[PDB]
Amino acid sequence: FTLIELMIVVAIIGILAAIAIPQYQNYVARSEGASALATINPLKTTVEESLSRGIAGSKIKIGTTASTATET
Amino acid sequence: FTLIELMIVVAIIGILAAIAIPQYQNYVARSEGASALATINPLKTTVEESLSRGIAGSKIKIGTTASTATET
């Protein structure tokens, strides 16, 4: 081993240790909103169906408790 | 390529892989019944016509075998 190789390696290390990094927060901030609406939009179909069929409001809830001929 | 971009992509993939899916069986179950009755209701007109014209029952059948002055 010599000093030339070691110095060249040290210089190349510092050279590589200079890559810039741009922002990456707005991407996730927008992806979260693009998914929230896509997930909570389809409920309007069920709401309109329940309001136009015959049953009144209030009884319309969320979860997984089966269904019947009165509550949705 | 760096690790920041890859990790952000992996995180956005998992974020997108979270959209909920509501039920979609009652819609078809109701559409089938809404079509069955709509298809098999009009036969009452022909039944009443055949019973009020003069010909008796029994001879009233279904299919596509033409018609005459006795059978419907």
UniProtKB/Swiss-Prot annotation, chains A, B:
Protein name: Type IV major pilin protein PilA
GO CC annotations on file: cell surface; cytosol; host cell endoplasmic reticulum membrane; pilus; plasma membrane; type IV pilus
Post-translational modification: Methylated by prepilin peptidase PilD at the amino group of the N-terminal phenylalanine once the leader sequence is cleaved.
Annotated localization: Fimbrium; Cell inner membrane; Host endoplasmic reticulum membrane
Source species of the chain: Pseudomonas aeruginosa (strain ATCC 15692 / DSM 22644 / CIP 104116 / JCM 14847 / LMG 12228 / 1C / PRS 101 / PAO1)
Transmembrane segments: 1-21
Source taxon at top rank: Bacteria
Entire-sequence positions represented here: 7 to 78 of 149
Subunit and partners: Interacts with itself to form a multimeric tubular filament structure with a diameter of 51 Angstroms. Interacts with PilJ. Interacts with PilS at the inner membrane. Interacts with type II secretion system (T2SS) components XcpT, XcpU and XcpW. (Microbial infection) The ssRNA phage PP7 infects P.aeruginosa O1 (PAO1) through the retractile type IV pilus (T4P). PP7 binds to T4P by interacting with a single pilin subunit PilA through the Pilus-Interacting Region (PIR) of the phage maturation protein (Mat), and is brought to the cell surface through pilus retraction powered by ATPases PilT and PilU. Then Mat enters the cell envelope, causing pilus bending and pilus detachment, which impairs cell motility and restricts the pathogen's virulence.
Residues with N-methylphenylalanine modification: F1
Similarity comment text for this entry: Belongs to the N-Me-Phe pilin family.
Domain comment quoted from the record: PilA subunits constituting the T4P exhibit a classical pilin fold featuring an extended N-terminal alpha-helix linked to a C-terminal globular beta-sheet-containing domain, which are packed tightly along the pilus. The N-terminal helices constitute the pilus core where they stabilize the tubular assembly via hydrophobic interactions. The alpha-helical core of the pilus is surrounded by the C-terminal globular domain of PilA that coats the outer surface of the pilus, mediating interactions with the surrounding environment.
Gene Ontology annotations of biological process type: cell adhesion involved in single-species biofilm formation; regulation of calcium-mediated signaling; single-species biofilm formation on inanimate substrate; type IV pilus-dependent motility
Keywords recorded for this protein, A-Z: Cell inner membrane, Cell membrane, Disulfide bond, Fimbrium, Host endoplasmic reticulum, Host membrane, Membrane, Methylation, Transmembrane, Transmembrane helix
